[PDB]
Assembly symmetry: D2
Homo-oligomer: 134 residues x 4
């Protein structure tokens, strides 16, 4: 599970949003610091939380990686991103996780839901998971 | 973390040892049933627990995926295996995880340690993690 | 924490239903094996799952320990129980959880909900948590 | 459960050191925000981290709640504290944990260990868990 101190949207933001991420091995430390083991893959969308919230407002579509769900939302434009792949998945802790970098520019698909009570009142509907990029 | 009901060696055996695994999408259900989210990658060694315990008994070498550790052990022979890769990493639960199959035959490297009190007394030293395959 | 391989009803039964429990220090081992740390308190209702499902048919009331919920149900009568209190809550693991036995006879209040798809199809409504005892 | 971003000493201080805590129902929110479920009990020692580090210099004793450990230390004197007891342990989440306040003055016993690499280098030995109070 996610760290209990974070809402789904807050944990989404920590993992999936970074406007100018450093190289993956550095950028991933901010995520893995909250974990017991290294995340095997992660995509940083180079955008803002507010921008993703706006994408939550368009037409509801099927989630490509969760095909029983239809609370997903696709961006109208391709966005710059940085994908990170764990090179040493046998790592037993987070002291030494190494990542390969794959920059790109793709549409993204997010699942959105009603906010958590701990979420800011500014956005009643928020992204809760990055489903995929296209 | 691992499920607390299992020792490191017991959880290793559930993930890493299967003599005749079915296709990955089926085989992985046995692992993911104990998890909240799908495992992103997994290698089934087509061998027995006792055989891996014997490999724990050879010369201690550096762990390729944990280079500050030197409690790893490499098999003397290549062993048949099945590697499973998660095709839909955006899956939000374990109901629908889909895997790609990659059979192979490789040396394996395991980290071994003294057993847990809950582990069987038969093996005082046991494999606790699959570090990598070669 | 509930192990994901169990439904809420299955986990409820494991923690809260035992017709003839042994001493608490023995009885609690089965529950604590699913945990990283000793459970601080646990009440074993000396009853059957069928008895509790019957109570789910009683008048719904507000849950005393979850006041925003109204799917709770109080037993019409007191039932025999074994309450277990953790003697050494400073324990850092589950190697030696020690409990004081407090046998008794009290009313119980359970929350009841529609069955999980994994639950038996023959009980459409099942107990999912022990709210309190009186 | 201790969030991995904290050392044992840091997590000890968060749970067990508060010089002037507010009412328990307020004071416990900071601890329960790191948790999925309400903590059943918690003792706030009204002291300073420097005071507790001094106690680590006292005569080592067997840990009362961890009898296989001998790195515990008892305070020479009673110290002011606030003990908090969970009123509604049937609570299913941390939305409304309610606590009873039990102010007091007791001896405390802490386990002390060598610092984590992430801990300040200026205290070579630090408290890592509150074993019990007397
Ligand atoms: Fe993992
Ligand atoms: Fe606990
Ligand atoms: Fe708990």
């Amino acid at each position: 599970m996610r760290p209990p101190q974070f809402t789904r949207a807050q944990w989404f933001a920590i993992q999936a949003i970074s406007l100018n991420p450093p190289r993956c091995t550095i950028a991933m430390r901010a995520i893995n610091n909250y974990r017991w083991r290294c995340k095997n893959q992660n995509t940083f969308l180079r955008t803002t939380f507010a921008n993703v919230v706006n994408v939550c407002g368009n037409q509801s579509i099927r989630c490509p990686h969760n095909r029983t769900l239809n609370n997903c939302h696709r961006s109208r434009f391709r966005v710059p991103l940085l994908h990170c792949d764990l090179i040493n998945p046998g790592a037993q802790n987070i002291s030494n996780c190494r990542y390969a970098d794959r920059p790109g520019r793709r549409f993204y698909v997010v699942a959105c839901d009603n906010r958590d009570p701990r979420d800011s009142p500014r956005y009643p509907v928020v992204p809760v998971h990055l489903d995929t990029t296209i």
